Subunit: 450 residues, 4 copies
C-alpha cells in the first residue's frame, strides 16, 4: 500500500526537507542582511509568491492562448486572459494594435521562440554586443548569423551612425534593441528608421527596463518596434516568467492594405517550445505583478529607482570613479574599474564577501576578464531605500573598492594572489558588519506581515 | 510617493489581487472535484510548493553549476548541491560516472540545450514521431536535420528493426528515446546497439516516466544512454523544472584508450548560455525536495501503484471491449484506440472535459484517432486499482454517451457539438464524477496540525 | 619591344612545346593500341575537335543565353542557338515544352547550377548511392541534405519500393535519377509517381546514356522528369561540355493554370556560375556532336553499343563471372569480382598494364576498397567493333583476371604484396602484346583522313 | 548499319557541319576586323589550341593529381606533371613551399572547390564587391556567409582601413582578394596583416592579372596569400582552364611549433569531388603549353607592353577630359567613368559594339555607371602605345557619337535605341575600326611555313 497522502503531500517543508528549509531560511536572512545591487534582481511581492506557489503549478494546458474559458480550462483561461489584458494595460497598448503571448517559460526561451517565429535558420541578426557565434553564446548566435552593433568607444553611447552603416551593409532580417548593462535610453525612432532602410524587423528585449517602460519612465519600444519581449522579475518586479508582445492589425505604409502576420507565427513557435504546457503558476503570478505595476505606487517606485541610480552614480563619480556614459537614465550604472587598476572579478568577489552583490561586467574594450561591475537600483528601491540611502551604498562601494585596492597592493594583482588577502581580513569583516547593520534597517517584501 | 513596502509587498494575495485569488481558489476546487487523467499532470507536495514560492525566486545566479559555497551564493550553492546529489541518488547513479545539471528552466529548454551542447546546426537527429497541423514543430526539428522512427503501425510497439534500418541509412548524430504517449517500456539496450552501429549519441527524454525510473519500475535509460533529460512534474511529482544527466568518466571499449566522456563542460556551457537572467532557483530548491521525496519507500509504493492502476484501468477498458494501443500498458499511461468505435479523440476529450474528466486526444490525416490517459495524478490522490476501475466505468459511461451523441446528433464536428447542450446525461455523469472525486485526499496544501 | 606574333602564336605545338607535343602523340598512339572500356569515355569526331580547338576559345560572352545575334555576338549567338535547337532535336523535345541551357562548363557544374537554381541550401536530396556528406563527396552532398536510395541487395535492380518508402519518409525537395554504373534502364514513370507523392522535383542526370537516350535506345527521362542534365562526351560522343534541360510552359494538373518557372531560375544560376563567360568552343563543338547524334548512323551506333555490351556480358557470364543484375540494358556491365576473390583495384591495375582501361567500381556491399570493375562499350563501338569483337574483349578480360588470380596466388592478396608480381611479368607482356595487336586492327576517329 | 568510322569521325568540320564551320569562319573574321577591349578576353596561341583540340579530350582521368606514370595514365601524368612544375616555375614558386592543382574545369569551379576545401557551409567570407538585378549571385555568396569590402567611394581605391574595420567586426574565415575591374595593384601585405588580426585564410583570385603576376609586373599574391586561384585565358594567354595554388610546408611563426600547412589534401579532395567524369585533360595539356610560353622573355615583354598600353590608353582618354576610376591604371585595364558625361555603360557598350569595339559596362541603382576596357587582347595582336592611342581616338569618336545620339534622339533607353539605325556616323566609325583592326597580326592559326 501507499503512504497516506498528507505525510508526503500536505506536510511543511520544515518537516519534509529540513536541510532545504534551513538553507532557504538562511538565504532569506541573507537577502535581508545585505545590499543586493544585481541589476536584474528584484524583491517581488508576497502576493506574487502566493500565486507562484499555488495549485496553478498542477494545471496542464495546451500552450496555445486560452480561448475556451469552459471545462477544465475555465479558470486558467480567465487567469491567462487577465494576464494578457493587464499586460496590454501596464504597457499602455491598444489591443487592436498589440497582442501579447504570456506562455513562455522565461525571457530567453521567449526570445528564441520569437526569433524562431519570424526568422529562418541562419537569417542575419544584429543586437548590442551580440556575439557572432568565454562569455555567453546563446542559441541566437548559434542558429542565426549574428553581427553586433557596439557603443561608441569613447562616449559609451550607441554609435547610431555605425549601426546604420552596419545595418545597411550586413542587411539583417531582424535588429534587436534593448541589450542589458546599457545605462541610457534607446532612440527607438532611429532604430525604426534604420530597420525601414534595410528591411529588417525591429524587436526590443526590454527585460531590464520593463518596469521603467510600464511606468512610462523611459522610452516605450512599442512606439517603433514590431515585437517586444521581456522577462518579468527585473524592474517589473514580478515572477521569473516571460512574455512576447507583437503588433496586430494594419501595417504602416510601404502594401495594398496588408496586416501584421505576427500572432499565428508567434503562437505556434511558443506552443512548439512548450513540452508539457506552460508554467500556469507563472502566468498567475505574472497577472498579479502586472496589476501591481499599473498602480500609482508603482509609477512612484519606478521614478525612485531612476533617482536612486542617478544619486548613486553622482556619488561614485564625485569620488573619481568611471561610469560608462558618465551617468544613467535608467535603473543601473556601469562602473568601469579599469582606470582604478582593478578588475570586476576582484570588486565583485570582495563586495560579495561584504554582503554587497554586484555583477562583474564587460566594459567597452574587454576580451571573461571583465573590467567593470554592473550595479542596479531596483532591488534596494523595492525595500524603500531613497537617494540618501543610495548615497550610503555609494560609500559602501567606495570602502569596498578602497579595500580591494589595499588587498591588491599587499597581495598582488593576479587573482589567486589577490585571493590570499580575503582570508581572515579585519577590514572585510568590519565592512560586512556595517553592510549588514545598514541593510537590516529596511523593510522586505515577499512574506506575510499581519 | 512610494507605497509602504508592507502595503504592496507583504500583503496576502486575497487582498492585493482578489480576482486572481478567486480564480486560483476556483481552480483549486476544480482539481479536487474532477478526475485528472492528463498523463503529464501530477499533484505535487505542499513542501515542493513551499520551496517554490519562497525567496529563492529573487536570487540571481550566473547559470553555471555553483561551487562557491560562500558569499551571496553560499546557500543556493548548497541547495543546488543537494539537488545534484539527490538527483544522482534518486536514479541510482554513481557520481564518478554521472553528472547532472539542474539549471534549465524546463524540459524543452533542457532538451534543446542538451542538443546544442553535443550537436551542431543541421546535425541529424532521430526521435519517436519527431517531425522533419495541430502538432508541435519544435526547435529540435527546425535547427537540426530530424527524421522520426515510428511504432509498428499494426502492433503499436517500437519497430526496432525498422529503426536500425533508418539509423544505418540516415546516420543520425543523435538518437532520442522516450515518448509522450508510448504505453510500453523502451529497449535501451537495443537503442545502444543501434547507436553504436551508426555512431550516434544516445539520449533519453525520460520526462514522462522519470518517477518510474527512480522507483526502478521501468528500465533505466542510464544503463545505455549518454545523456538523460527530464522535466520533473510528471511521474516524478516535482516542480515544473528541468534536468540534464550526462555520463562522466572513462568511456566503454575503435576509440582511444584511457578516453573519457566530454559532456560536462559542453552541457554546462549550453545551459549557462540559455539562461539570460539566471535560472529559477526556486525551481532548483523545490526539485531538491521532490528528489528527496522520490528517494523514499513511500514513493516506490506510489510508483508501483501508478503502474498497477494503469494496468487495472487498461484491463477494465478492454474488459468492456475497447482497444488499447499495444493492448495494454507497462507504465503510467494507457493509449485508447477510438477508431474501432468510429470516434475521434477530439470528440471524447471534449465530452469527458464536460464531465470533469480531463484526457488528451492522441495520435495512434491530422485528426486524432485516440485518447491518452495517465495514472500518476489520480494515484497521487490515494486512488488504488478499484478506484481506477471506477474511473474506467466513468470513462465507459463517458465514451458511451459520446457514441450516443455521434450516432444521434450527427457525426460531423458541427452536428456533434449541438448535442452537448443542457445534456442531462452529461450533467449527471459530471455530478457522479464530481461526487467521486471529492472522496479522495489532495496533496499540495499544509494540514492544519502541521502548522506549528 | 615584343616578340613577333607568329613566333609564339602561329607556330605548331611541335615547335613551341616538343615535350607536350610528344606526350600527346604518345597518348594518341596509346588510345589506338589499347582497349578503352571506361564507360564514360568515348572517341569523338575530328569535326568536333576542330570546333573545340578553334577561335571560339577566344570569344567572351555574358553567360546568359544569347538573344542578340547582332554585333560582337552575332556569331556565337547563332552557334549557341544552333546548339540549343540541335539539342532539342536530338532528344526529340518540343521547344514549347522544353528549354535547354548549353552554357555550363561541364556536367558537374551543370548539375550544381541546376540544384542551386531550384533548391535552397540544406534542402533534402535523394539520388542513387548519393552520400550523406573515402569515395566522392560532391558539392551536392556537402551543401544539401543528401540521403541515397539503393539497389536491391540481391538483384542489383533499384528497390523502387524502398525508394518510395524512403521518399515518403525523408521528403526530398528533389529526387535525382540517373546514377552511373547502373546497367539497367530507369522506370521514370515510377520516379514521377514517387515524386508526385512526396512533392519532389524529379531531375535526371543522363550523362552516361545521353547517346542511348538520343537514339531512343533507352527510356527517355524527358517523359517524366522536370529537369534533365548531362555531360556530352560519354555515349553522346561529343566534347566535354554540359547542358541543362528544363520543362517550359504549362504544368500537369495538381494549380489554376500555373506554368513551369524553371527557365529564369536556371539561366541565372548558370550565369552566376560562369566567372569569365562560357567555353564557347565547347558550345560550338557540342552543336557539331548534336547534329551528328541526330543521324541514322548514330541510331545504329547506339544500337551496336547496347549489342556490344550485351555480347560482352554474356561472354563474361559464360566463363562464370558475376555481373550486377546479371546482364545489361545500356552501354555498360558492372562486374562483381568479389566472388572470384579479387578486388577491382587488382583487376584494373593488371588490365591497365595490358592496355585495357577499366574503372574499378564499388559493387553492392563495398565500404575505396572496390570489389568490382565498371566496363563500357561506347569507346570501342565508336572504333567500329561489333559483337564478335567484344567477345574477344571478353576473352582478353578472362585472360586478364585469370592472370590477376595467378599473380595473387604466387604473391599474395595484400595490394602491395600483389604488386611485386606485376614486375617483369611474361604473361603481362604477352597479354599486352595481344591487346595491342588486336586494338591496332580497328579504325580511330578524331584526326584527319584524306 | 554503322557509318564507316572515317565518314563521321575522320572528316573535317567543313564537311560534317558546314553551318557551324561557316559561323566559326565568320567569327574568326570578326575577331580580326574589330577592336577587342573586353578585359578578360585574350587571343591564345595556335600551340595552345592544338593541345586543346587533341586526343586528350578523350582521355579519362580520375581527377586526383596523377602520379602513376605508367599504364593508361603514363602520358597525361607526365603532361600534368609538366603543367604543375611549369605553373610553379611561371609564378616563381618553390615547390617545397607551394603546390598547384591543375584539374578544375574553369575559374569559378576552381574557386568554389578551393572554398569547399578550407571552409564549411555558412562560413564567413569577404571579397571585393562580393554580394550577400544584372549581377552574379554565385555559389560563394549562396552557400557561405558573405559580405563585401568596397573601394573608397570617392578615390576608387580599396579602402584598407574600412576593410580591416569590417574584417575585425565580421570575422571572416576567408578573405578573398582580386577583382574583375580593379585598375590598381593590391596590397597583399596589408591583406595578410588584416587576415592575421582576424584569424582569416587569405585567398587571391588572380585570374585577371595572372599574366602580369607571372611576368612580375604586379605584386605577387604568393608572398602573402594562403591560396591563389586563377583562370588561365586572360592575361596569361592560355586556355580557358582553372588552377589552384596552395601553400605547403611549415607555417610562419599563437600556433604550434613545427606546424605545417594542411591545404594539399583537402584541396585535392575538393577538386576530385567536383569532377564527375574526370577533368578536361585537353585543358591541362593546353595550359602546360601556355605556362611554358608564359615563362619566356617574349612573354615578359608582352606583359610590360600590356601595362604600358593600358596606361597609354588611359592618358589618352583623360587627355581628352574623360574620368578614369582612380584616374589611371597600374595593370591591364582602365575603368572609365561615364557619369560626368551623363551616360550609362550599357549605352556606350552598345554603340561601341556596333563599331566592332567590344567593351563591358561596369559598376563604378542597378544601372552601370562606367565601362571596363582591357589591353591584353589587342596587345597580343602586336599593338603598342600609339596603336592604343588610336584605339583611344576610336573610343573618343565612339563616345562622342553616343553623347550625340543621347542629347539628340533622347536620353531614355527607348529614345536612344532609335538613333542607332542606318546611322552614317556609326557606319563610318565601324569602317575605320575595321580598316585599323585588319592591320595587325593575329595569333591562333598555323603559319603556312611552319606546316612541315
Amino acid at each position: 500500500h501507499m503512504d497516506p497522502v498528507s505525510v508526503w503531500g500536505n506536510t511543511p517543508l520544515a518537516t519534509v526537507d529540513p536541510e532545504i528549509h534551513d538553507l532557504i531560511e538562511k538565504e532569506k536572512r541573507r537577502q535581508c542582511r545585505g545590499i543586493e545591487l544585481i541589476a536584474s534582481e528584484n524583491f517581488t511581492s508576497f502576493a506574487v509568491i502566493e500565486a507562484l506557489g499555488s495549485a496553478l503549478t498542477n494545471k496542464y494546458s495546451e500552450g496555445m492562448p486560452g480561448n475556451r474559458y469552459y471545462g477544465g480550462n475555465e479558470y486558467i483561461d480567465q487567469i491567462e486572459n487577465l494576464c494578457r489584458s493587464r499586460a496590454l494595460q501596464a504597457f499602455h497598448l491598444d489591443a487592436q494594435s498589440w497582442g501579447v503571448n504570456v506562455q513562455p517559460y522565461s525571457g530567453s526561451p521567449a526570445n528564441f521562440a520569437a526569433y524562431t517565429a519570424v526568422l529562418n535558420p541562419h537569417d542575419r541578426i544584429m543586437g548590442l554586443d551580440l556575439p557572432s557565434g568565454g562569455k555567453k553564446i546563446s542559441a541566437t548566435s548559434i542558429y542565426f548569423e549574428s553581427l553586433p552593433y557596439k557603443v561608441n568607444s569613447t562616449t559609451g553611447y550607441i554609435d547610431y551612425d555605425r549601426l546604420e552603416e552596419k545595418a545597411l551593409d550586413f542587411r539583417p532580417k531582424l535588429i534587436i534593441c534593448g541589450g542589458s548593462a546599457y545605462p541610457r535610453d534607446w532612440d527607438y525612432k532611429r532604430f525604426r528608421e534604420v530597420a525601414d532602410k534595410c528591411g529588417a524587423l525591429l524587436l526590443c528585449d526590454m527585460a531590464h527596463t520593463s518596469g521603467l517602460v510600464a511606468a512610462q519612465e523611459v522610452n516605450s519600444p512599442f512606439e517603433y518596434c514590431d515585437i517586444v519581449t521581456t522577462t518579468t522579475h527585473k524592474s517589473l518586479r514580478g515572477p521569473r516568467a516571460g512574455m512576447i508582445f507583437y503588433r496586430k492589425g494594419p501595417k504602416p505604409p510601404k502594401p495594398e492594405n496588408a496586416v501584421y502576420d505576427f500572432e499565428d507565427k508567434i503562437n505556434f513557435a511558443v506552443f512548439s517550445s512548450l513540452q508539457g504546457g506552460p508554467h500556469n503558476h507563472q502566468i498567475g503570478a505574472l497577472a498579479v505583478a502586472l496589476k501591481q505595476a499599473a498602480s500609482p505606487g508603482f509609477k512612484a517606485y519606478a521614478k525612485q529607482v531612476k533617482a536612486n541610480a542617478v544619486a548613486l552614480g553622482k556619488y561614485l563619480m564625485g569620488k573619481g570613479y568611471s561610469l560608462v556614459t558618465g551617468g544613467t537614465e535608467n535603473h543601473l550604472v556601469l562602473w568601469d574599474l579599469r582606470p582604478l587598476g582593478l578588475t570586476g572579478n576582484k570588486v565583485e568577489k570582495l563586495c560579495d564577501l561584504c554582503n554587497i552583490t554586484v555583477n562583474k561586467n564587460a566594459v567597452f574594450g574587454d576580451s571573461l576578464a571583465p573590467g567593470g561591475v554592473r550595479i542596479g537600483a531596483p532591488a534596494m528601491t523595492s525595500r524603500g531605500l531613497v537617494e540618501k540611502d543610495f548615497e550610503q551604498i555609494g560609500e559602501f562601494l567606495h570602502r569596498a573598492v578602497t579595500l580591494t585596492l589595499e588587498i591588491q597592493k599587499e597581495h598582488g594583482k593576479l587573482l589567486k594572489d589577490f585571493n590570499k588577502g580575503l582570508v581572515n581580513n579585519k577590514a572585510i569583516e568590519d565592512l560586512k558588519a556595517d553592510v549588514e547593520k545598514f541593510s537590516a534597517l529596511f523593510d522586505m517584501p515577499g512574506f506575510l506581515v499581519s
